[PDB]
C-alpha cells in the first residue's frame with residue numbers, strides 16, 4: 001500500500017509532491033523513504049568521506065521546502081548531542097548502521113544529561129526526530145566499516161546547538177556542506 005520509489009530519483013520526485021503543501025504527513029514521508037531500497041550505484045557520487053569526521057553532502061534543495069543530503073560516517077565517526085532548530089528531521093540508513101541515542105533537554109541547572117532512548121537503525125530504516133521528541137547523538141556502530149545515511153530537513157536550517165553531556169551547556173554551531181550535488185565545497 002506504500003508507494004515504493006524504485007530509484008533515488010523517484011524518491012526525490014515523490015518528496016517534491018509531499019512537501020509542495022503546507023501540511024506534511026510524517027508517517028507517510030517516513031514510510032516512503034524507508035521503502036526506497038538503498039542502491040549504492042545511485043548515490044555513490046555523493047559518498048565523499050573525510051578521515052577525521054563525518055561529512056554532509058547536499059543532494060537536493062527541495063525548492064526551498066526541504067534539504068535532502070547524504071551523510072558519510074567514517075570508521076568510528078559520531079556526532080555531538082544536538083537539536084534540530086525546530087525542523088522536521090528524517091534519517092534513513094543507506095549503508096552500515098547508526099546508533100541513535102535520544103537525550104532529554106537540559107534545565108537551566110547544570111547537570112549530567114539523561115538518556116531517554118537508545119537504538120540501532122537497521123538496513124534501509126527511516127527514523128524521525130524534532131525538538132519536541134528530544135535531542136540526539138548519532139554514531140557509526142562500526143570501527144571497521146563506514147555508515148551512510150540519507151537525511152531530510154524541513155524547513156532547511158544551517159545552524160543548530162551542540163550540548164556538553166557533562167553539564168547540559170550548549171553552543172551554537174554553524175553547519176557546513178562537504179559537497180553539493182557531487183561537487184566538493186571550498187574548504188572541507
Ligand SMILES: [Fe+2]
Nearest residue numbers: 082084136138
Ligand atoms: Fe541529528
